[PDB]
Amino acid sequence: LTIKNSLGQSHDYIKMFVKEGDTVVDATCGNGNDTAFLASLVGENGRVFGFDIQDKAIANTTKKLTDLNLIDRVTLIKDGHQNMDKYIDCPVKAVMFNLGYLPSGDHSISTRPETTIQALSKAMELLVTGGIITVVIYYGGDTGFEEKEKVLEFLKGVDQKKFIVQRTDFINQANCPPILVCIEKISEG
Amino acid sequence: LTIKNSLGQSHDYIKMFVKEGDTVVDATCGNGNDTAFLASLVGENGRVFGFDIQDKAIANTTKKLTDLNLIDRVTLIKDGHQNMDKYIDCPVKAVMFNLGYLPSGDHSISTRPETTIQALSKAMELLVTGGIITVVIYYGGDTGFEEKEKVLEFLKGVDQKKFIVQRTDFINQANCPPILVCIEKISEGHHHHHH
Numbered sequence: 001l002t003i004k005n006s007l008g009q010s011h012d013y014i015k016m017f018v019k020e021g022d023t024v025v026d027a028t029c030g031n032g033n034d035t036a037f038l039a040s041l042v043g044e045n046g047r048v049f050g051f052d053i054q055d056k057a058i059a060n061t062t063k064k065l066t067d068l069n070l071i072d073r074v075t076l077i078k079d080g081h082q083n084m085d086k087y088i089d090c091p092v093k094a095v096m097f098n099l100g101y102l103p104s105g106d107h108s109i110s111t112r113p114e115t116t117i118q119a120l121s122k123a124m125e126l127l128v129t130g131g132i133i134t135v136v137i138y139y140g141g142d143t144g145f146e147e148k149e150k151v152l153e154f155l156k157g158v159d160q161k162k163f164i165v166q167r168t169d170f171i172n173q174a175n176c177p178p179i180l181v182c183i184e185k186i187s188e189g
Numbered sequence: 190l191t192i193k194n195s196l197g198q199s200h201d202y203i204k205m206f207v208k209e210g211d212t213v214v215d216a217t218c219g220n221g222n223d224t225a226f227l228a229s230l231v232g233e234n235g236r237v238f239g240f241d242i243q244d245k246a247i248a249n250t251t252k253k254l255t256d257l258n259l260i261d262r263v264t265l266i267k268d269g270h271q272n273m274d275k276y277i278d279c280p281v282k283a284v285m286f287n288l289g290y291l292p293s294g295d296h297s298i299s300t301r302p303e304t305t306i307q308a309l310s311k312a313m314e315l316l317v318t319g320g321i322i323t324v325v326i327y328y329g330g331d332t333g334f335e336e337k338e339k340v341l342e343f344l345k346g347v348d349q350k351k352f353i354v355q356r357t358d359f360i361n362q363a364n365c366p367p368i369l370v371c372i373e374k375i376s377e378g379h380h381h382h383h384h
């Protein structure tokens with residue numbers, strides 16, 4: 001038994017909260033790993049909304065899910081996660097954010113603070129009470145660094161009466177260990 | 190289902206790691222809540238070492254454990270946790286730290302950075318591989334911020350090849366929400382530099 005990294009822990013937190021038949025969101029599709037993960041947890045009567053701004057990422061995720069017989073429960077949308085409210089009107093149980101750039105792709109196309117903060121606000125509104133958002137933050141680069149600073153600033157201002165914002169950090173590791181943020185809705189209004 | 194605070198999460202982390210028959214330590218006895226908790230996890234053939242520097246805290250912990258039929262496997266020691274190596278020679282599975290002053294007690298008698306750091310080194314040495322230390326850090330109020338700052342600065346320096354050090358923090362809460370640090374041993378030995 002070993003304490004998992006932030007990427008591993010996000011899956012563990014999602015498994016705790018997501019049951020079968022739920023509506024969940026992968027806000028950052030990429031290659032489709034988290035999308036397939038969310039799809040397997042949610043079952044045949046559940047729904048996964050997936051978002052990416054790249055055609056390469058949507059195609060790779062479509063390929064992944066079709067291979068695993070999971071494409072039927074997934075709605076893939078080629079739009080920014082900051083516009084997630086245009087496509088979803090029901091309450092969601094969970095939203096996964098994995099911040100940064102697509103692996104084995106274009107490294108100049110990455111998540112931006114402005115649109116991430118927007119998506120987070122939309123995700124927080126869409127959440128059912130007792131619902132979870134997980135944010136795996138990468139900060140290795142200049143662009144990663146800038147996003148971490150801004151996202152965390154924003155999340156520090158979230159009403160504690162409405163949301164629990166939990167940060168998990170490995171403080172003795174060098175070379176920017178990825179940070180986990182868990183946001184759980186506890187009250188409406 | 191709700192995400193627990195640091196205090197609640199420390200117990201959850203301890204439950205993950207501690208099985209029956211293990212040797213565990215409560216480094217900050219207080220009223221004996223964590224001591225009782227450790228005693229119930231560890232069973233008849235296990236051992237709990239408890240530490241505090243106050244006579245009031247040892248007596249309240251003794252009363253607690255006797256009331257719950259748990260005093261049998263607990264060794265209560267009226268000494269600082271910085272001296273835990275004088276009393277323990279076997280490898281331990283877990284150590285619990287709860288930093289601050291005694292609740293419903295003397296507010297000026299609290300854990301000090303120097304001795305906490307010492308006890309943390311001793312606990313880290315005493316830990317079996319795959320063992321855990323949990324540290325609930327209280328700060329602000331009468332307690333102040335100096336212990337939090339120094340303990341965390343010390344723990345940032347711990348060899349990552351030997352220990353995982355994980356901080357859990359509620360960043361949208363005001364009024365100094367307690368911080369959880371989890372230290373897990375992943376390797377025996379130590380890498381020292383050169384002189």
Ligand SMILES: C[S@@+](CC[C@H](N)C(=O)[O-])C[C@H]1O[C@@H](n2cnc3c(N)ncnc32)[C@H](O)[C@@H]1O
Nearest residue numbers: 028030031032033034052080081098102110111
């Ligand atoms: C770190 S990757 C996600 C990792 C993914 N979970 C996986 O396993 O492959 C971040 C993704 O978010 C996408 N992205 C960047 N900006 C976005 C935006 N504004 N809205 C939605 N997605 C965006 C990128 O195209 C990239 O594929």
Ligand SMILES: C[S@@+](CC[C@H](N)C(=O)[O-])C[C@H]1O[C@@H](n2cnc3c(N)ncnc32)[C@H](O)[C@@H]1O
Nearest residue numbers: 217219220221222223241269270287290291300
């Ligand atoms: C926050 S309280 C612990 C709470 C306790 N776990 C409980 O169940 O109530 C901190 C305790 O550590 C004790 N303490 C202070 N300095 C100590 C030291 N150097 N060694 C051992 N205990 C110490 C205090 O007397 C106090 O009882």
